[model samples]
Target chain A: DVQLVESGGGSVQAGGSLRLSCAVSGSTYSPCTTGWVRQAPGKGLEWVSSISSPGTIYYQDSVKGRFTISRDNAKNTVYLQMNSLQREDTGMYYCQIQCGVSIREYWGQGTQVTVS
Target chain B: VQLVESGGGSVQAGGSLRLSCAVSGSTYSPCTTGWVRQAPGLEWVSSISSPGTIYYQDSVKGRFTISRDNAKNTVYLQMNSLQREDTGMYYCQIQCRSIREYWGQGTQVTVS
Candidate 1:
C-alpha cells in the first residue's frame, strides 16, 4: 500500500511564509501526481494545489499566487510553499495521490499549520 | 458560487443514505460535480462529469453512487449498507475544466 507522511508545518506569524513536505513510501514518485488539500477548523475541505505529470502544477483560485506546489522525484517527496500567510490559513493540510482525473486514492495523516 | 447541501441525518448500520447539493450562481449542466467526506481525513467518494459519466473511488466503488440533475441544478450522493465509520461531514464539490472550484458547507451524517 502507498503511504504519504507529511511534515514541516507549524506556527508562523501572519505575513510570513512556510513550507510543508510530503514524503512518499511504498511507491516511486515520478509516475504519480500528488495534490494538497486543507480544512480549517470546523470547515469543509478546500483544494489547495496539485503537481501533475511532467511538472505541471495547478492551484485553487484563492491560493494561486500565494501557494506553490513542487515535487522531487528522486527524493520521493512533494513540497508546498505558502507565502503571505494569514490567520485564515490555519488548518490541517493533507497530501494525496491522484489516481484519476480528480480522483484521489490515498491521503496523508495531515500536518497542522497555524498562522498567528 | 455556492453549493447548498442537505439530506443528512442519523441512519442505522446497514441502512442506506442519500445526500443532495443544489448549485447556485453558475450553470450546472456543463460542470463536473463530486462528493467528499471528512472522516477525520478527507475521502473522495465519487464524481459525475458532464453528460453523466461517473467515477468512484476504489474503496467505496460498489457502495456509492453520484448523479446530477441538470434541470434541478443539483448533485447527489447515495450510499448503501452504511457503517459507523461512515459518520462524517459530507461535502459537495464543483469543478470546471477539471479543476475543483467550489465546495458545500457540508452535511453531517451519523451512522449508529
Candidate 2:
C-alpha cells in the first residue's frame, strides 16, 4: 500500500529546465530505492536515473550528462531534474520505487512534460 | 533493439495466466528480464531472473510469480487465480546488470 505522487509537469522551453518531484508515502525511502522512467510521446520507456537508500545516484548513460537525480530522505521525496530540455523530452515521466531488491514495483501516475 | 510483449486474452477470474516478452538485438542472454504493468489507471513493475528466483513488492507476493526460460531467451510472468483487478497491460524490460535500461512495448491483459 505505497503511493508515489508526481508533480511539477507541464511545459518548459527548450533552453530551460524543471524539477519533477515524487512524494512517497506508506514507507520510509529506507530499505528501498527510488528512480525515474520516461516514455517519450509514442516511444518506448527509457531509464533515467535512480537514487539509492543512502542517497547515491546512478544515471543511465544516455542521460548521464543532462539529468540529475536526487532525493531528500527527511522529506520523503525523490527528484528528477533535466537541464536544457529538448523537443524529444516531451512525454510522460514516471516515478518508481523498488522495495528492497525487487524491480521497480510501484509507480506514480506519471507527469507529462512538453518541451517546445 | 527490439522488445516485443505477447500474452493471452481476457482471462476468467480465478484462472491462471502466462505472459511472455521477447528480447532481441542484444548480446545479453537475459538471465533476468525486467517487467512492468499498467492497469486501467494504475501502473506496476517487476522482473524475473534466470536463477528461477523471483522478487516483488510487499503488496503483491503470494499469487504473483516470476521466472525465466534461458533456452528461449525470454521472460515469463505467471499469475494464478486472476481477479478482475488483474486486467491491464504488462511490459518486459531489460535488467542489464541491475538497471532496467530498456522496455518492450506493453501487452494488454483483461480479466472478467
Candidate 3:
C-alpha cells in the first residue's frame, strides 16, 4: 500500500476558491506523479489531473485551466486548487499519489469539499 | 447516447447475486465501457472491461467482468458472490479515444 495524504481545510463556501493538500512522505512519489479526483455526490469518482514534483501538471482532458497542482519538497506536500467553484464542482477532491505504467493505483486520503 | 444504470442497492447478506451498470446509444460510435466501484471513505474500485477485452482500474481486473450486446446497444458489468469488500457504488464510464469521456450516475451496493 502507498501513502497518499490530503486534508479538507481547503473547502470553499460556495462561490469561493478551494485549495487543498495531499502530502506523502516516507514513500517515494516515484513512477507516477500526484493528481486529484472528484467523487460522485454519493457515487463514484472522476479523474481531474496529475502533478509532478517540480510543479509540472497534466489535466485529464479539458480540465487543465480550472485546476492547479504544486509541490513543496520541504514539507513533501502537494496542493490542488480551483479558482471559481460551482455547485457541481463540489465533492471529495482527493490528491491521489498515482503510479503505474498501464493502469493507475492511487494512494491518498480523500478530502471531501462540500459547498453550501 | 442513452445512459446505462448500475442496478440494485442495499443487498441482503449471502444473497446470490449479480450487479451491473449499462450504457447505450453508443451504437454509432460504440465507445469502450467498464464498471467501477467505490467504497465509503475509500477510493473507487477500478473497473473491469466488458464483453471481450477491456477493463478499468487494475485493482478490479479480476473480480469484475464486463459485457455488451451491440445489437441491443447496451453494455454491462457483472459481479458475483457479494461480500463486505464488494460493498460500494459502481459506475459505468466510457473510454473514448484516450480519456474517460462519459459516466452513468452510479449503482449503490449496500451489504447488510
Candidate 4:
C-alpha cells in the first residue's frame, strides 16, 4: 500500500516555471522508478517521462528538456519541474508510482496543472 | 530496428477470436507483460494478470487472460469469454534490459 501525494500548490503560465513532487511512504525499497504521465483535457493518456530507479532523474523526449526531476531518496521524495511552459501543455498530470514492474499498481490523486 | 507489430483489427461477436502478436527479441517472458485501457476520461486502468509465470496488477480478473509465448519471444493478452468490458484498446507491453517499451501498433478489439 504505497500512496503518492499530489498538490496544486499553485499555477503557472506559458513560459512560467512549475515544480511538483511525489512523496512516498511505507516501502523501504528504493529500487523502483517514478513515471509522470499527462492526460490532456480530452485526449488519451500519454507517457510523459520517467526518473531513475536509484535516484531522482527524468528521461523523456526533447520536448521534456524543459522539464527536470530532482530527488531526495532518503526522504522518498521525487520532484518534477517544467520550464517555459506552453498553453498547449495545460492538463491534469498524474503520477503512477511503478518500481520493478509496469502495472503501475499505485497511483496519485492527480494534480490539475493548468498551463495558461 | 526494435518493433512489436500485432495482427487482427476487429473481432465480431459469437466466436470471432481476435489474435494479437507483439514481436520483440530484447525481451520475453522473463520480463513483465500487462494490458491497459485508455477510456475517454484518460482513465489509465492497469488491468490484472495471472500470477507466478508473470507479473500482473490485482484489479483485472476473469474473462481476460495474459500469458507469454516465451518460446516465440512474444507476450500474449487474450480475452476469452469476452464481454463488452473486454473491448477497448489493448496494448502488449514489455519491460526488459532495464527499459520499458511498447509495441509498434496495438490491435483494437471492437466487439460487435
Best by lDDT: 1
Give per-residue CA lDDT, model 2, range B1-112, as digits (tens).
Answer: 6776887578778888878887777656544666676675445545666655566644457887767666677777777888887777777766554544577778777888
Off by over 4 Å in 1: A26-33, A60-65, A101-105, B27-29
lDDT (10s digit) by residue, model 3, range B60-90: 4555665667666566565555667778776
The local distance difference test score of model 4 is 0.57
Give the CAPRI class of candidate 1. acceptable
Candidate 3 error regions (>4 Å)? A12-16, A24-30, A33-35, A39-66, A70-78, A86-88, A96-102, A114-116, B25-34, B49-64, B67-75
User: Candidate 4, residue B24: CA error in Å?
Assistant: 6.7
Ranking by DockQ: 2, 1, 4, 3
The per-prediction i-RMS, to one decimal, reads 3.0, 2.7, 4.4, 5.1
Residue B88 lDDT (model 3): 74
What lDDT tens digits, residue by residue, belong to model 4 across residues A29-115?
Answer: 446577676656756455666766655454657446888877677777777787887876677777666664434545566687777
lDDT of 3 at B98: 35
Order of all candidates by TM-score, from best down to worst?
1, 2, 4, 3
Give the DockQ of candidate 2. 0.52
TM-score of 1: 0.82
- Error in Å for residue A44 of model 1: 2.4
Clashing pairs in 3: A4-A107, A4-A108, B4-B22, B47-B56, B49-B54, B49-B55, B50-B66, B51-B66, B51-B67
Summarize candidate 1's per-residue lDDT along A51-78 as a digit string, tens digits: 7756778888788799989899888789
Residue A29, model 4, lDDT: 47
- List-wise, what DockQ does each model earn? 0.40, 0.52, 0.18, 0.18
lDDT of 1 at B42: 74
